[PDB]
């Protein structure tokens, strides 16, 4: 992250060892469950590209996930270079240069360059964009590691309705289908795969019933 | 680690008690699993040789692991002395002397010497090299304590494919074979030791199929 | 082969009918076992490219093996042409021209050309190189026809250790893995797949035990 | 071998392809049984060191046997060099030089040198000595590959006595014990391990009975 010294200047501060260890525990203990993404977003709050690469070093022992992340990052960097062509000409002495795709990811840039780029009026967030690319890669990884399809999430004969709903929505978040497909799933498949008693109640409830009404009507069933 | 005082001078800061306690919990509770190495790397982030020896004091009650670490450290120090002979002659007043193998490990050096050595332009990282030697020793220890061979990692009849892949790759990381041998293992043994249904599907998939394609084709099997 | 006439001149001699019949028996009766390669090497001893094509005519009824051989030969001829470019310019009257890839295989050359090329001071062996290409093709064929993986070679409960070792090494020769992979196989998999009594003895024997020591310790078990 | 041309000069003749194929069949089909040694002696009759190395090329795919052969050959060559020191001084123009250990094995010598060395009055057999070294190596290999100890050769309850004697003596030839130990074995162990009826008859026959008398007395038992 970025901190201010006693002289009022923006200075980079390294990630604390226990934050890095929390990230390591998340990587090594949760098997790339969907909750890894909110935890990564929280643990990398206000980070620099060098800090993000330090956090990514934890993923390196997982070859498939790391390769997927690297492919996503390279594609995003190529797209960034395509959409931000290197202008040929003079540059104002008071204005800093434009970083490239290899520079936002911190492959060739330095710490001071990123500190200056992030701290500006108006600021151009380089850490946030790299973080978003990491999140795209992580979403792909979570999709790859998902053990069950949404079509295989069925309510147990004695399973409470709220637990079935939680499992269903967790699997839906893992799968990351299209928005229209997701809406169709939440509207139709959730009712379709319920157990007979809750299914009868939900059918009696009618189409267009909100999730709150369904959980109310199926609370003790 | 190294911190800056109000006067702008680099000053050593001791490891916080809770970071040391986290390291103690890792040592005493995980039985030298492969995840001990990323956790040690995170918890010793930006540390000095004195801090590294403080962290190593936790390993001392484990006689075999500590002896293996000491052997690896002594061998690395001897190699460092061989590759960095003590030059006989004058030394510039503004340039500090060259530490020996017993000095990078902090056996004979002092805190100020290591602080000066690490904080330089350009810097010579003494903490990182000692840390790498520790990691070599820890890798040897993890290999020693591994309970199962990779040849004994077989998918259960009802075990999901992703869990089998995770166990297989964790054992592979523990064993630390040669790169060519590791590639052969990931290409052949993973398919060989799968359960009959996934094995049939993977055989139909053909050689050279990526891990993502295999996990996709075996998701619900 | 090449023989000398009464005048001291090198003359080509055709392969005897019974040598050709021995080669035919090898091709038609052994199902491309690994021993086909030493037998082909012995039976084609000191042969000319025309003789080698005569021997290859026996393989033609086997479409897959013959196609694999032709692909290997064409690739080797293309590589030979690439590494031996046709020089444009004068040629010494006493020095013969350089054969092409289609010429070493005897597709376009004549018998006298090959006789002169092989009989020279210093000699340039054209028959040996074509033979080596044939051996590469035959190795590929033997790999294709191998019925069992090395991972499936397991010592029987009452099988003598020497027979298990012979089967293991025959399969290893058939598979033709990389040298490092082969060393790992002979060091680890042979012990891993032995029966419980021999496995206990070999484990007690320790790593780095020679094959002779293992066969001595497991002789009557 | 060595043949004479029309001018009366000794000329080397290569081994015929079918003799080499017979040797290949012996190597690849008999699993280093004791009969491999008489067959090698017959098939290498009157051979040159180059011919012997050509025959040894068949053994190369068998790593353990080939390594044992190479160790025996190197030891014999070192002993030959020790017992035949290189004399420093003039050499007669009509007398050829003394080959070294690397020269009798054909590693550095040429065909003409060996032809001249073998064809002399009086002749110094270089092929025979190399052949004897090969036979020592092969005897070691046959000992290594022997599946049963002599102590485990026991006559079956209905096995004819002549077959038991043949198996016993074949195992004894494989084991190659000391002469006194071999005499003790043939005198005591053969009677000891016979079946009860033949054992009773042989005990009644008394010590010092010849093998012919034993086979006569046990013919139909």
Author numbering:
A (entry chain A), B (entry chain A), C (entry chain A), D (entry chain A): 1 to 221
The authors write:
The HIV-1 capsid is a fullerene cone made of quasi-equivalent hexamers and pentamers of the viral CA protein. Twelve CA pentamers occupy sharp points of curvature—termed declinations—exactly 12 of which are required for the capsid to completely close.
Crude modeling indicated that these two substitutions are compatible with the backbone configuration of the dipeptide in the pentamer state, but not the hexamer state. Indeed, incubation of CA-G60A G61P with IP6 induced assembly of small spheres of around 20 nm in diameter. Cryo-EM imaging indicated that the spheres are T = 1 particles, or icosahedra made of 12 pentamers and no hexamers. We solved the cryo-EM structures of these T = 1 capsids to 2.2 Å (CA-G60A G61P), 3.1 Å (CA-M66A), and 2.4 Å (CA-G60A G61P M66A). These confirmed that the mutant pentamers have the same structure as the WT pentamer, with the switch in the 310 helix configuration and the gate in the open configuration. CA-G60A G61P formed only aggregates, supporting the interpretation that the mutations locked the protein in its pentamer state.
